[PDB]
């Protein structure tokens, strides 16, 4: 059939980035153990996870594969919308976190027209930090093709993860740039030194961040994957 | 079959440079007329250049595609080598083109003990030129790895062409950096306002030249593009 499978196309180790909308029909078990990954292995019983992801590949979502379209996501960013989904057990989930999480979606959120989008954002430790503004490009492109007017989200809720060297260092290194303009920002103990992180930035602070986020390397992935 | 296969696989604009072995069965045409890019159209007419293609597949070879690993290479490197080719109708040609390369070969054949790699390098001009430097390094390490010892050839004579831009300008930036190493370096009478350009560089200076070419995205390719 093809004369050049099995004909020496493997020789040389080649790692794209190559990114994909969310697919139902692959992504879900992959999906799965990311969230494991972002909450840990506590705050994991406490969230229904089939749910969540099943959430997620119904949202706007970004996913990145090195092996291919049938392959496993190693990376995703999704923006679920937080009033369509105001009964989910996620939800849920976020308004016992913490008081300022419950006062917020009250009063800035349910008061009024605002939106607010819960991200989820998760990848493999080995994944580079430099596919992130694409990553964050993309999705939030998906959002405002889809809304039209180039209409976005007003607010996002971003949970992340942190740990002590024994010092405090980043998972996700874009969290820097996200805490210097979130909002509101808390965090959890430490857990078998890992932190749970908790940060709600409005629309210009998550820009903001994005752009102070790229590298010559982010800036070369966004000219060589993104939407028609 | 494949059920990834439309399903909205290609929302996303995805350009990858993935690098491969020279291959007999496909790169054939693509490699003659690179080469006639890079030789031009009067210089062309004095090369066999079906001879040169077929040595270039049966050299160290390493090409790039966009398009996957049957379509056509948009880039190539290959080191031919000097000696076993010694006869060849491409170093007949280059022996004529100017006394500076017949007494560069004259103190190379008498020496005996030296080696030295024919260099023929040739790209569409829309590719990327961070791509030169991963492309180096993985021929580079074909010979070695075929030679064994960290062995490596002794010089390289590479063609190539720059341009009037009515001030004289490359179409390869990567030769800039050779010229400054260069062992011997001249060049003919513009014609058409493109002016042929020959180099001989030893090794030490050919490392030299590549290292000065590094870019932070040229180090991501070679981080993500190289031999296992
Ligand atoms: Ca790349």
Redesign the interface.
């Given at each position: 059939e093809?004369?050049?499978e099995q004909?020496?196309?493997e020789?040389?180790?080649?790692?794209?980035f190559?990114?994909?909308?969310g697919?139902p029909?692959?992504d879900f078990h992959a999906l799965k153990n990311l969230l494991r990954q972002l909450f840990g292995p506590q705050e994991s019983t406490r969230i229904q996870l089939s749910s969540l992801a099943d959430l997620i590949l119904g949202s706007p979502t970004?996913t990145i594969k090195t092996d291919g379209?049938?392959s496993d996501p190693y990376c995703f960013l999704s923006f679920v919308d937080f009033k369509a989904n105001h009964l989910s057990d996620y939800v849920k989930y976020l308004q016992k976190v913490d008081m300022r999480l419950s006062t917020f979606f009250k009063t800035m959120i349910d008061s009024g027209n605002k939106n607010c989008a819960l991200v989820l954002s998760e990848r493999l430790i080995n994944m580079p930090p430099?596919v992130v503004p694409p990553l964050y490009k993309?999705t939030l492109e998906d959002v405002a093709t889809a809304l039209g007017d180039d209409k976005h989200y007003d607010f996002y809720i971003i949970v992340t993860r942190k740990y002590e060297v024994n010092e405090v260092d980043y998972f996700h290194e874009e969290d820097r740039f996200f805490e210097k303009y979130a909002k509101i920002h808390f965090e959890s103990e430490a857990k078998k030194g890992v932190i749970s992180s908790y940060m709600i930035l409005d629309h210009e602070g998550l820009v903001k961040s994005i752009d102070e986020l790229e590298?010559?390397?982010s800036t070369?992935l966004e000219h060589?994957?993104?939407?028609?």
């Open positions: 093809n004369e050049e004909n020496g196309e020789e040389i180790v080649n790692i794209d190559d990114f994909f909308g697919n029909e692959v970004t379209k049938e430099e993309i590298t010559e390397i070369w060589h994957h993104h939407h028609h």
